[PDB]
Symmetry: C2
Subunit: 115 residues, 2 copies
């Protein structure tokens, strides 16, 4: 099964719907089910990469593509004052779903430290 | 002046030193002067891109390169239990230095929300 075998795989194969913001041959962007800011969406690759520590060097462009799509969607959503992009890796990072995903949060002042 | 005209530009041209972890033709990684976790370093491009919202599509590979170098340095530093990567954009994002930089934090349980 393409898209991997996580909850994200089902979204990718459209077995389950989501508030899809954007989609191309390489990735898909959709709103987070538990937003932590007025605007909070995810950008995930269609290719199954379980975590960033498992990405290959060949995956560079694709990883760079998620940030480019993230900045574009953020513009469409009108995040004029900025935003924060976050990739969590492993238990200390706070990763629960093992399929790489980039968080884009905005619409409020993000604080420091970032968790 | 190459490397841009921010504090990071000076680090890039080596006008001012830093705890450099890694360097190649495309980027440089060094520890944060105000760490927010046991391990907290930055990965910055040598090319001056002021912010993520200003990156061009051609910048994809390079942006993807920062995450790949970040995951490699994290491995060398022994962040076995994971980490969090963060890119701040603009005022709401918390960006103070206008030269793109990726934060890699680890060595402790990162919390949620990420700021």
């Amino acid at each position: 099964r393409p898209g991997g075998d996580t909850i994200f795989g089902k979204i990718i194969r459209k077995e389950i719907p989501a508030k899809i913001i954007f989609e191309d041959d390489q990735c898909l962007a959709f709103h987070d089910i538990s937003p932590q800011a007025p605007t909070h969406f995810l950008v995930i690759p269609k290719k199954h990469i379980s975590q960033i520590s498992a990405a290959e060097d060949a995956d560079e462009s694709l990883l760079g593509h998620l940030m480019i799509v993230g900045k574009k969607c953020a513009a469409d959503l009108g995040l004029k004052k900025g935003y924060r992009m976050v990739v969590n890796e492993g238990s200390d990072g706070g990763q629960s779903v093992y399929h790489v995903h980039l968080h884009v949060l905005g619409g409020r002042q993000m604080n420091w430290p970032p968790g």
